[PDB]
Amino acid sequence: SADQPKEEKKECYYNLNDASLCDNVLAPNVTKQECCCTSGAGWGDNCEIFPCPVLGTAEFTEMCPKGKGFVPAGE
């Protein structure tokens, strides 16, 4: 539950954040799975974001088991 992307909605980040500088600028609040699966850059709580996705890698593959382009914007 806690040791895996699940039941946890936050602000998406297409730009970045570096989990310390917070760099959203146009990003809806959703579940890392959706935001990242869209192909963003980071998902978290302003400044506390996780570099996502990574495409063809562990991270993404997790937040997006279907394919890149599920949610709006990055669809």
Short mmCIF file of N, CA and C in Angstrom, two decimals:
data_model
loop_
_atom_site.label_atom_id
_atom_site.label_comp_id
_atom_site.label_asym_id
_atom_site.label_seq_id
_atom_site.Cartn_x
_atom_site.Cartn_y
_atom_site.Cartn_z
N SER A 1 0.84 -1.23 0.00
CA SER A 1 0.00 0.00 0.00
C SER A 1 0.86 1.26 0.00
N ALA A 2 1.70 1.40 1.03
CA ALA A 2 2.58 2.55 1.14
C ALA A 2 3.86 2.34 0.36
N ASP A 3 4.25 1.08 0.19
CA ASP A 3 5.47 0.75 -0.54
C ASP A 3 5.16 0.50 -2.01
N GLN A 4 4.40 1.41 -2.61
CA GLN A 4 4.03 1.29 -4.02
C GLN A 4 3.01 2.35 -4.41
N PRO A 5 3.14 2.92 -5.61
CA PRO A 5 2.22 3.95 -6.11
C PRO A 5 0.77 3.49 -6.08
N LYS A 6 0.05 3.88 -5.04
CA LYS A 6 -1.35 3.51 -4.89
C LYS A 6 -2.06 4.42 -3.89
N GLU A 7 -3.37 4.58 -4.06
CA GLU A 7 -4.17 5.42 -3.18
C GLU A 7 -3.36 6.62 -2.68
N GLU A 8 -3.09 7.56 -3.58
CA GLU A 8 -2.33 8.75 -3.23
C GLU A 8 -2.40 9.79 -4.34
N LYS A 9 -3.33 10.73 -4.20
CA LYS A 9 -3.50 11.78 -5.20
C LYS A 9 -2.76 13.05 -4.78
N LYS A 10 -2.13 13.70 -5.75
CA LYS A 10 -1.38 14.92 -5.51
C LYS A 10 -1.39 15.80 -6.76
N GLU A 11 -0.57 16.83 -6.75
CA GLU A 11 -0.48 17.73 -7.90
C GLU A 11 0.52 17.20 -8.92
N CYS A 12 0.09 17.11 -10.17
CA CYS A 12 0.95 16.62 -11.23
C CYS A 12 1.94 17.70 -11.65
N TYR A 13 3.01 17.30 -12.32
CA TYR A 13 4.03 18.25 -12.75
C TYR A 13 4.62 17.87 -14.10
N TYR A 14 4.20 18.56 -15.15
CA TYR A 14 4.73 18.29 -16.48
C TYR A 14 6.14 18.84 -16.58
N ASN A 15 6.36 20.03 -16.01
CA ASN A 15 7.69 20.63 -16.00
C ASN A 15 8.55 19.77 -15.09
N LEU A 16 8.93 20.27 -13.92
CA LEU A 16 9.69 19.46 -12.97
C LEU A 16 9.43 19.90 -11.54
N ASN A 17 10.33 19.52 -10.65
CA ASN A 17 10.20 19.83 -9.24
C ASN A 17 11.49 19.52 -8.50
N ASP A 18 12.16 18.46 -8.93
CA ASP A 18 13.39 18.04 -8.28
C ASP A 18 13.14 17.78 -6.80
N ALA A 19 11.86 17.60 -6.46
CA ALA A 19 11.47 17.35 -5.09
C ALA A 19 12.23 18.27 -4.14
N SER A 20 12.15 19.57 -4.39
CA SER A 20 12.83 20.55 -3.56
C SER A 20 12.72 21.96 -4.14
N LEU A 21 12.55 22.06 -5.45
CA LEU A 21 12.43 23.35 -6.11
C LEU A 21 11.01 23.58 -6.62
N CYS A 22 10.23 22.50 -6.68
CA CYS A 22 8.84 22.58 -7.14
C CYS A 22 8.74 23.35 -8.46
N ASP A 23 8.45 22.64 -9.54
CA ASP A 23 8.33 23.26 -10.86
C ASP A 23 7.14 22.72 -11.64
N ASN A 24 5.93 23.04 -11.20
CA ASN A 24 4.72 22.58 -11.87
C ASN A 24 4.42 23.43 -13.10
N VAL A 25 3.58 24.44 -12.93
CA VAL A 25 3.21 25.32 -14.03
C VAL A 25 2.32 24.60 -15.04
N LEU A 26 1.06 24.41 -14.68
CA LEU A 26 0.10 23.74 -15.55
C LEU A 26 0.13 22.23 -15.33
N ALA A 27 -0.60 21.77 -14.31
CA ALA A 27 -0.66 20.35 -14.00
C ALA A 27 -1.79 20.08 -13.00
N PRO A 28 -2.70 19.17 -13.35
CA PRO A 28 -3.84 18.81 -12.49
C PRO A 28 -3.44 17.90 -11.34
N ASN A 29 -4.28 17.86 -10.31
CA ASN A 29 -4.03 17.02 -9.15
C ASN A 29 -4.64 15.65 -9.34
N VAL A 30 -3.80 14.63 -9.43
CA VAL A 30 -4.27 13.27 -9.64
C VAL A 30 -3.33 12.24 -9.01
N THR A 31 -3.50 10.99 -9.40
CA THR A 31 -2.66 9.91 -8.88
C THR A 31 -1.44 9.71 -9.78
N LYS A 32 -0.26 9.78 -9.19
CA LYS A 32 0.99 9.61 -9.93
C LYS A 32 0.82 8.66 -11.11
N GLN A 33 0.02 7.62 -10.91
CA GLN A 33 -0.23 6.63 -11.95
C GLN A 33 -0.81 7.28 -13.21
N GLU A 34 -1.75 8.20 -13.01
CA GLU A 34 -2.39 8.90 -14.12
C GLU A 34 -1.48 9.99 -14.68
N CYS A 35 -1.07 10.91 -13.82
CA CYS A 35 -0.21 12.01 -14.23
C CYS A 35 1.00 11.50 -15.01
N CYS A 36 1.82 10.70 -14.35
CA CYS A 36 3.02 10.14 -14.97
C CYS A 36 2.67 9.31 -16.20
N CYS A 37 1.68 8.44 -16.07
CA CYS A 37 1.27 7.61 -17.21
C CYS A 37 1.00 8.50 -18.41
N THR A 38 0.72 9.77 -18.15
CA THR A 38 0.47 10.74 -19.20
C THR A 38 1.78 11.14 -19.86
N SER A 39 2.88 10.96 -19.12
CA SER A 39 4.22 11.27 -19.59
C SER A 39 4.64 12.67 -19.17
N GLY A 40 4.64 12.90 -17.86
CA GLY A 40 5.02 14.20 -17.34
C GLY A 40 6.50 14.28 -16.99
N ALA A 41 6.78 14.61 -15.73
CA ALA A 41 8.15 14.74 -15.25
C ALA A 41 8.26 14.45 -13.76
N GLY A 42 7.22 14.78 -13.02
CA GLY A 42 7.22 14.55 -11.60
C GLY A 42 5.82 14.64 -11.01
N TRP A 43 5.57 13.89 -9.95
CA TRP A 43 4.26 13.89 -9.31
C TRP A 43 4.39 13.87 -7.79
N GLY A 44 3.80 14.87 -7.14
CA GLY A 44 3.88 14.94 -5.69
C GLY A 44 3.18 16.16 -5.12
N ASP A 45 3.56 16.53 -3.90
CA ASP A 45 2.96 17.67 -3.22
C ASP A 45 3.90 18.88 -3.22
N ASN A 46 3.76 19.72 -4.24
CA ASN A 46 4.57 20.93 -4.38
C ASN A 46 5.92 20.83 -3.67
N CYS A 47 6.98 20.64 -4.45
CA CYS A 47 8.33 20.54 -3.90
C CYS A 47 8.66 19.11 -3.48
N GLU A 48 7.62 18.31 -3.27
CA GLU A 48 7.80 16.92 -2.88
C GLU A 48 7.31 16.02 -4.01
N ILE A 49 7.92 16.19 -5.18
CA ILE A 49 7.55 15.45 -6.37
C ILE A 49 8.58 14.37 -6.71
N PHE A 50 8.14 13.33 -7.41
CA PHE A 50 9.01 12.23 -7.81
C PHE A 50 9.16 12.20 -9.33
N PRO A 51 10.40 12.32 -9.83
CA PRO A 51 10.69 12.31 -11.26
C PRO A 51 9.95 11.20 -12.02
N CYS A 52 8.83 11.56 -12.64
CA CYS A 52 8.03 10.61 -13.39
C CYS A 52 7.46 11.23 -14.65
N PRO A 53 7.39 10.44 -15.73
CA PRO A 53 7.83 9.05 -15.75
C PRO A 53 9.25 8.90 -16.28
N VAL A 54 9.62 7.67 -16.63
CA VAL A 54 10.94 7.39 -17.17
C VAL A 54 10.85 6.70 -18.52
N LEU A 55 9.64 6.32 -18.91
CA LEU A 55 9.41 5.65 -20.19
C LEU A 55 10.21 4.36 -20.28
N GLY A 56 9.58 3.32 -20.81
CA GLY A 56 10.25 2.03 -20.94
C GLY A 56 11.16 1.73 -19.77
N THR A 57 10.66 1.96 -18.56
CA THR A 57 11.44 1.71 -17.36
C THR A 57 10.54 1.31 -16.19
N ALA A 58 11.17 0.95 -15.07
CA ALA A 58 10.45 0.55 -13.88
C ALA A 58 9.36 1.55 -13.51
N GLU A 59 9.78 2.76 -13.16
CA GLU A 59 8.86 3.81 -12.77
C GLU A 59 7.61 3.79 -13.64
N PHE A 60 7.68 4.49 -14.77
CA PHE A 60 6.56 4.56 -15.69
C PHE A 60 5.77 3.26 -15.73
N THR A 61 6.41 2.22 -16.24
CA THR A 61 5.77 0.91 -16.36
C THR A 61 4.82 0.66 -15.18
N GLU A 62 5.16 1.22 -14.03
CA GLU A 62 4.34 1.06 -12.83
C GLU A 62 3.14 2.00 -12.85
N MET A 63 3.41 3.29 -13.04
CA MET A 63 2.35 4.30 -13.07
C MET A 63 1.49 4.18 -14.32
N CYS A 64 1.96 3.41 -15.30
CA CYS A 64 1.21 3.24 -16.54
C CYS A 64 1.42 1.84 -17.12
N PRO A 65 0.62 0.87 -16.66
CA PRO A 65 0.70 -0.51 -17.14
C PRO A 65 0.07 -0.69 -18.51
N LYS A 66 -0.69 0.31 -18.94
CA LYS A 66 -1.36 0.26 -20.24
C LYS A 66 -0.47 0.85 -21.33
N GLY A 67 -0.30 2.17 -21.30
CA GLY A 67 0.53 2.84 -22.29
C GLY A 67 0.53 4.34 -22.12
N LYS A 68 1.55 4.99 -22.67
CA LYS A 68 1.68 6.44 -22.58
C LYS A 68 0.57 7.13 -23.38
N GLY A 69 -0.24 7.92 -22.69
CA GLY A 69 -1.32 8.63 -23.35
C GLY A 69 -2.69 8.14 -22.90
N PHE A 70 -2.89 8.07 -21.59
CA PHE A 70 -4.16 7.63 -21.04
C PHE A 70 -5.02 8.81 -20.61
N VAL A 71 -4.45 9.64 -19.74
CA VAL A 71 -5.15 10.82 -19.24
C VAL A 71 -5.09 11.96 -20.27
N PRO A 72 -5.81 13.06 -20.02
CA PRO A 72 -5.82 14.21 -20.93
C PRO A 72 -4.46 14.90 -21.02
N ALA A 73 -4.28 15.73 -22.04
CA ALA A 73 -3.03 16.44 -22.24
C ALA A 73 -2.00 15.55 -22.92
N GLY A 74 -1.44 14.62 -22.16
CA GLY A 74 -0.45 13.71 -22.71
C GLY A 74 -1.07 12.57 -23.49
N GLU A 75 -2.38 12.64 -23.69
CA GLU A 75 -3.10 11.61 -24.43
C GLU A 75 -2.61 11.53 -25.87
#
